């Protein structure tokens, strides 16, 4: 019985490979050989957000593209005002081992989580004026590596227990649990329509889930090592993943396989964070090599470098209006680039 | 300029002031330690003498605070969450010296910690626990360490090794062989920026806190000397 199931799974894998090979009519690099390169994309540090006393582990922008939240090893969840560098808030954290932070699309709530296996929702629009823990979400059996607000009521969190969970914040219960990853899920990215989200785990695979149905639509493979970052394309029909094999790869949801790979011989340091520009033409990747490289998502040629961080770049985000790029680092400094 | 802008700037300055107050208040004369080990080791009882899944242990020795973090709520896969402990002053690695079957697993874990990209700067305070049980096992002799390590047959006790007054030579040779097994990995690829501090601790040892204090003092002194080009 077990052998029959294994053989049928192997033949299903072969059939999927054959279908993908049939769909592979051409390649993104071959098709985009006609279009001109974007040229030397050079940005400069327009703001250096000082105020973190330890390594910055994560950040998240606001939908207003002005307020951004950052999390650090010092145990502070500072909401910044990038326009004027003013610190709007500074939230003390119960655990200093936070690995992720999320800022709600409405801006009323901010979330964080980490090695404490708990996603903590903080109210920013409280009538008393002092931010307090609105809700603590428990149920993950591993470190919470990423979280993203669906809305004021729903949040999606990925954990080191190989599962992604959808939460109902007002009740504090797991509305939906997503299973299928065999490694620590390291990051998740929400689609523009919020009906789908991808996750990148330590099994070198990325899976697309259905938020409403709790089922996995596709599995994307090709990466060689643990995937550290993931980010949907602005179109919503593709995403890019950064892994420990020092390679970024772009996958297409409808084509069900990767389109282009972003790697070089001299690049031997893994990617810690990936993000797309507003048009999706630029893929920004943060590496362990203290630097970030601006890739040409349609041509896989490094169009620029965001040199300027003194330690490992841990987080990287682009505003919803595409006006700026913020990169945090282990040197306790968060920089705004433009 | 405007009233809202002035209020925002004053709030930012107040937040920065409170933030700077918190920073030094909690970071001066306090040190963070990562407690690593296996299930069989007495990691939870090393400095327990006067002690969300991260058992935090706080102890004081000489007006210096030590925050010892024990991660115990994750899966056995640890290549990812261990990078959060880059900035700890030392890693407290506990080994069950009596269990030879898992001692190679402990050696592999020590090697991975030693050679990790984000842990190659942290100095490991090795604690070879269960010394009494190791002594009893070697004295009984039913289980032979040569089966798990054939190169123990050619091993001889180091000249400067300091056995206990009532300690048997066979026990001394076995325990120092295990310590040398760890120290070989420590010195094979060590860049000189971090060091291993082996200690023969027991289940009833009440001086592990002082040992950690002295080792951290030595680690910080060596870091200061390296920073001042004195070492």
């Amino acid at each position: 019985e077990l052998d029959q199931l294994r053989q049928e799974a192997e033949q299903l894998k072969n059939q999927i490979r054959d279908a993908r090979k049939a769909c592979a009519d051409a390649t993104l690099s071959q098709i985009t050989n006609n279009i001109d390169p974007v040229g030397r994309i050079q940005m400069r540090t327009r703001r250096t957000l000082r105020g973190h006393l330890a390594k910055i582990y994560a950040m998240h922008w606001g939908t207003d593209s002005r307020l951004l939240v950052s999390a650090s090893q010092d145990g502070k969840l500072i909401i910044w005002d990038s326009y004027t560098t003013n610190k709007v808030h500074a939230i003390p954290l119960r655990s200093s081992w936070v690995m992720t932070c999320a800022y709600a699309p409405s801006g009323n709530y901010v979330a964080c989580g980490g090695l404490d296996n708990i996603c903590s929702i903080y109210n920013l629009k409280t009538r008393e004026g002092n931010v307090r823990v609105s809700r603590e979400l428990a149920g993950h059996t591993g470190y919470l590596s990423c979280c993203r607000f669906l809305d004021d009521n729903q949040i999606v969190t990925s954990s080191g227990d190989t599962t992604c969970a959808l939460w109902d914040i007002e009740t504090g219960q797991q509305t939906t649990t997503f299973t299928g990853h065999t490694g620590d899920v390291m990051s998740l990215s929400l689609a523009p329509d919020t009906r789908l989200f991808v996750s990148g785990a330590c099994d070198a695979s990325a899976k697309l889930w259905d938020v409403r149905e709790g089922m996995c639509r596709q599995t994307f493979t090709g990466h060689e090592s643990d995937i550290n970052a993931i980010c949907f394309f602005p179109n919503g029909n593709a995403f890019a993943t950064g892994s420990d094999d020092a390679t970024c790869r772009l996958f297409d949801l409808r084509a069900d396989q990767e389109l282009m790979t972003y790697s070089h011989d001299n690049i031997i340091c893994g990617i810690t964070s990936v993000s797309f520009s507003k048009s999706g033409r630029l893929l920004l990747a943060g590496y362990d090599d203290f630097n970030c490289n601006v890739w040409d998502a349609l041509k896989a040629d490094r169009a620029g470098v965001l040199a300027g961080h003194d330690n490992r770049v841990s987080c990287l985000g682009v505003t919803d209006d595409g006006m700026a790029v913020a990169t945090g680092s282990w040197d306790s400094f968060l920089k705004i680039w433009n | 300029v405007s009233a809202e802008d002035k209020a925002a700037a004053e709030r930012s300055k107040m937040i920065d002031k409170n933030l700077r107050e918190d920073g030094e208040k909690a970071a001066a004369a306090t040190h963070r330690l990562l407690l690593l080990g296996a299930d069989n080791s007495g990691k939870s009882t090393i400095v327990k003498q006067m002690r969300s899944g991260i058992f935090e242990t706080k102890f004081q020795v000489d007006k210096v605070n030590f925050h010892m973090f024990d991660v115990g709520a994750q899966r056995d896969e640890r290549r990812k969450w261990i990078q959060c402990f880059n900035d700890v002053t030392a890693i407290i690695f506990v080994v069950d010296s009596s269990d030879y079957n898992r001692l190679q697993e402990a050696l592999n874990d020590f090697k991975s910690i030693w050679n990790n990209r984000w842990l190659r700067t942290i100095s490991v305070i090795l604690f070879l626990n269960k010394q009494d049980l190791l002594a009893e096992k070697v004295l009984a002799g039913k289980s032979k360490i040569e089966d798990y390590f054939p190169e123990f047959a050619r091993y001889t006790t180091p000249e400067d090794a300091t056995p206990e007054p009532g300690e048997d030579p066979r026990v001394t040779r076995a325990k120092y062989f295990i310590r040398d097994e760890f120290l070989r990995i420590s010195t094979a690829s060590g860049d000189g920026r971090h060091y291993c501090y082996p200690h023969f601790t027991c289940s009833v040892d009440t001086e592990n806190a002082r040992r950690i204090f002295n080792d951290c003092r030595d680690i910080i002194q060596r870091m200061h000397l390296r920073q001042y080009e004195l070492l």
């Epitope: 190989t162 065999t182 490694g183 330590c202 099994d203 070198a204 493979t221 090709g222 060689e224 090592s225 643990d226 420990d244 094999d245 020092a246 031997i268 893994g270 | 899966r75 056995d76 896969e77 640890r78 290549r79 261990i82 697993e105 592999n108 090697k111 991975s112 910690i113 030693w114 050679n115 990790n116 990209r117 690829s189």
Partner: nanobody
Framework: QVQLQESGGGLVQPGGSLRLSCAAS????????MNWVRQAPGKGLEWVSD????????SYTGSVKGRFTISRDNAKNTLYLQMNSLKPEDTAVYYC?????????????????????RGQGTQVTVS
């Protein structure tokens, strides 16, 4: 897809010889360290041998020292374990395991229960 297919191994008399072979796919064999991990019946996973990227540095478990010989063929993307003078204590399922990251000399979760970069494994029985 990162795939590691193990071939060879089976029934053998004590003192015999078996040569396990592992075929790598989906990754560059030369950039990663390779291990051999075995799981005796009723026992957890145990790390048997090791080999670096080039193969100059080879490590062994003390029990299998002088009997097993780990061989790496970078051109053929194959990892071998020349097992000599087998004994009944060697009966286990043998997994070729790939270290998680390239260009690194540390291998953290190779012996994990659900490590992603092992193979299905081959049963080796000594009798």
């Amino acid at each position: 897809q990162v795939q590691l297919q193990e071939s060879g191994g089976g029934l053998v008399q004590p003192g015999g010889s078996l040569r396990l072979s592992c075929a790598a796919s989906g990754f560059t064999f030369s950039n990663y360290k390779m291990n051999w991990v075995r799981q005796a019946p009723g026992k957890g996973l145990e790390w048997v041998s090791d080999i670096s990227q080039s193969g100059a540095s080879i490590s062994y478990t003390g029990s299998v020292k002088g009997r097993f010989t780990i061989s790496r063929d970078n051109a053929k993307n194959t990892l071998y374990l020349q097992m000599n003078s087998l004994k009944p204590e060697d009966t286990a399922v043998y997994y070729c395991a790939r270290c998680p990251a390239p260009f690194t000399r540390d291998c953290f979760d190779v012996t994990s229960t659900t490590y992603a970069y092992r193979g299905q494994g081959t049963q080796v029985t000594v009798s």
